Design a protein around this ligand. Structure first.
Ligand SMILES: *[C@@H]1O[C@H](CO)[C@@H](O[C@@H]2O[C@H](CO)[C@@H](O[C@@H]3O[C@H](CO[C@H]4O[C@H](CO[C@H]5O[C@H](CO)[C@@H](O)[C@H](O)[C@@H]5O[C@H]5O[C@H](CO)[C@@H](O)[C@H](O)[C@@H]5O)[C@@H](O)[C@H](O[C@H]5O[C@H](CO)[C@@H](O)[C@H](O)[C@@H]5O)[C@@H]4O)[C@@H](O)[C@H](O[C@H]4O[C@H](CO)[C@@H](O)[C@H](O)[C@@H]4O[C@H]4O[C@H](CO)[C@@H](O)[C@H](O)[C@@H]4O[C@H]4O[C@H](CO)[C@@H](O)[C@H](O)[C@@H]4O)[C@@H]3O)[C@H](O)[C@H]2NC(C)=O)[C@H](O)[C@H]1NC(C)=O
Ligand SMILES: *[C@@H]1O[C@H](CO)[C@@H](O[C@@H]2O[C@H](CO)[C@@H](O[C@@H]3O[C@H](CO[C@H]4O[C@H](CO)[C@@H](O)[C@H](O)[C@@H]4O)[C@@H](O)[C@H](O[C@H]4O[C@H](CO)[C@@H](O)[C@H](O)[C@@H]4O)[C@@H]3O)[C@H](O)[C@H]2NC(C)=O)[C@H](O)[C@H]1NC(C)=O
Ligand SMILES: *[C@@H]1O[C@H](CO)[C@@H](O[C@@H]2O[C@H](CO)[C@@H](O[C@@H]3O[C@H](CO)[C@@H](O)[C@H](O[C@H]4O[C@H](CO)[C@@H](O)[C@H](O)[C@@H]4O)[C@@H]3O)[C@H](O)[C@H]2NC(C)=O)[C@H](O)[C@H]1NC(C)=O
Lengths: 52, 126, 52, 110, 52
């Protein structure tokens, strides 16, 4: 719905909405990585063929 | 009267280890820190380390750690200064001095309060 | 000690994991005496464990 | 060599006053009040002179004094005598647990 | 004058312990003003007296 006449000021660098999106995305990624295996035995040494 | 005494003038040859003995005469050897000071002949004083007789714990200066280690035997009132791998740069007089007062609390190990001095010994090597 | 009258703590040695799961290394760390319990039922003086 | 810097000689005549500058930094002189001065006659054992910035033992007169100033504390003599024409070495705690010396200050009295 | 030590324990975490004691060994304590405690413990007495 367009507003017929408005006096307004915008600033995009101080907007808090993007910081909220950042918080949401990282805090949701942390949730998404919870239910999966955390490896841990693979810190064992790897003996890898010395190809040239 | 309290006095600090030492083994007299010393003779060795370079490379040999030396064992300078210090006698605590006329006071409690258990109650005061003892400090060792080097004096190259006619030169300024260099600091070696201390020893706690009642505890037996010691600390040698970083310039000599792993080369100098002091010990004592209260039954003979003797404090020792061990010094191995002797360079000829160790040409010097070695002193035995009475430091601060030992307490169960407090820490006077590092205080420069040397009250009395032993008569010393000039080590002969070249 | 000849009753040093100052608690000495106990200087202990044990094995710890290096940056690989499989290789091990000896370590040391001073611990206060009350947290360290002797292990053997016999009169052994050499071996100890944490109170937990 | 001394970590503490200090002069090697200041000369004159009896009755004067002196200032001899033993210098350190935050780690030895700045952070702590453990500073001392030692008399060293030619060929003699050292004699404790000033202890803990400025206090004096027995057998030591009010002809001598000293005081702290930041990272330099100095030996202030007064009423000079030719009998006291000795070397002088500052001394101070230096952190960890160590003791350090400085200088070669030969007093001279004509 | 205790000094911290860093002992690694598996991936991405460390165990902290006392590594060495600089200087000489001494005893920990608490100091309390003497006559103030004497006066305080008598002052508690003059109030505690009434129910005994
Ligand atoms: C919590 O609470 C704690 C308390 O529970 C508290 O602990 C206390 O901390 C303070 C630190 O702030 C400690 O203070 C120190 O105490 C030292 C001990 O002094 C007391 O005892 C001595 C014992 O004297 C022995 O030696 C004489 C010979 O000199 C003998 O004849 C005596 O019998 C006696 O016994 C020995 O010998 C017997 C022989 O038979 C033996 O049988 C026996 O077993 C012994 O071996 C007394 O002399 C002291 O009194 C004299 O000194 C005071 C202060 O000057 C005078 O006012 C007093 O009138 C006496 O004259 C005292 O009773 C102190 O020595 C020590 O003071 C020195 O060091 C401080 C820095 O620490 C300096 O600032 C100060 O100037 C002192 O320097 C002199 O001594 C040093 C050696 O230590 C010398 O190197 C120095 O050059 C100077 O020399 C003196 O002698 C020269 C000649 O030798 C002379 O020329 C000089 O001019 C000068 O006079 C310091 O005050 C205190 O001890 C702790 N308390 C306890 C119970 O341990 C703790 O801090 C609290 N903590 C907190 C967080 O609150
Ligand atoms: C209790 O225990 C702590 C340690 O756990 C002691 O603190 C140490 O004190 C020593 C004093 O000698 C420090 O070593 C000296 O460091 C100087 C430079 O400072 C370093 O440390 C500070 C603090 O992080 C930094 O800002 C700085 O950039 C350095 O990293 C050096 O200049 C000294 O060496 C020089 O002089 C000596 C002779 O004096 C020479 O032999 C050297 O070759 C060199 O020319 C010296 O190495 C040490 O850094 C301190 N450690 C810490 C962790 O602070 C306390 O002193 C001890 N006692 C008390 C009462 O607290
Ligand atoms: C507490 O106890 C632990 C052990 O229980 C002890 O740690 C060990 O200290 C020694 C001495 O510093 C370490 O070994 C040294 O390693 C250096 C490496 O450069 C060597 O140069 C040393 O060689 C000399 O000293 C040996 C005797 O220690 C001589 O046999 C040798 O011929 C050389 O003269 C020395 O080997 C050792 O690595 C540690 N061990 C561990 C697990 O860290 C610690 O010092 C004790 N601390 C206290 C306060 O008691």
């Amino acid at each position: 719905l367009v507003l017929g006449n408005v006096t307004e000021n915008f600033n995009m660098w101080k907007n808090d909405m993007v910081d909220q999106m950042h918080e949401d995305i990282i805090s949701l990624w942390d949730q998404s990585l919870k239910p999966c295996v955390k490896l841990t035995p693979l810190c064992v040494t790897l003996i890898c063929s010395n190809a040239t | 009267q309290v006095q600090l005494v030492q083994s007299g003038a010393e003779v060795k040859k370079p490379g040999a280890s030396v064992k300078v003995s210090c006698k605590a005469s006329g006071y409690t050897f258990t109650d005061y820190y003892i400090h060792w000071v080097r004096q190259a002949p006619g030169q300024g004083l260099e600091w070696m380390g201390w020893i706690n007789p009642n505890t037996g714990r010691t600390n040698s200066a970083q310039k000599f750690q792993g080369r100098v280690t002091m010990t004592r035997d209260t039954s003979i009132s003797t404090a020792y200064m061990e010094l191995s791998r002797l360079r000829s740069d160790d040409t010097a007089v070695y002193y035995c001095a009475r430091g601060g007062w030992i307490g169960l609390y407090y820490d006077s190990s590092g205080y420069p309060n040397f009250d009395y001095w032993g008569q010393g010994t000039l080590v002969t090597v070249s | 000690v000849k009753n040093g009258t100052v608690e000495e703590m106990k200087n202990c040695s044990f094995n710890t994991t290096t940056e690989i799961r499989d290789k091990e290394k000896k370590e040391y760390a001073l611990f206060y005496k009350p947290d360290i319990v002797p292990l053997s039922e016999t009169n052994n003086t050499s071996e100890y464990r944490l109170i937990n | 060599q001394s970590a503490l810097t200090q002069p090697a000689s200041v000369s004159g005549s009896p009755g004067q006053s002196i200032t001899i500058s033993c210098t350190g930094t935050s780690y030895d002189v700045g952070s702590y009040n453990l500073v001392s001065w030692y008399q060293q006659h030619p060929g003699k054992a050292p004699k404790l002179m000033i202890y803990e910035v400025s206090k004096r033992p027995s057998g030591v007169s009010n002809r001598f004094s000293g005081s702290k100033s930041g990272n330099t504390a100095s030996l202030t003599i007064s009423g000079l005598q030719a009998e006291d024409e000795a070397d002088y070495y500052c001394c101070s705690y230096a952190g960890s647990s160590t003791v350090v010396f400085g200088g070669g200050t030969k007093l001279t009295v004509l | 004058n205790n000094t911290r030590k860093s002992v690694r324990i598996g991936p991405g975490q460390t165990f902290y312990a006392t590594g060495d004691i600089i200087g000489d060994i001494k005893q920990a304590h608490c100091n309390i003003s003497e006559e103030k405690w004497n006066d305080t413990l008598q002052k508690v007495g003059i109030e505690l007296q009434k129910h005994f």
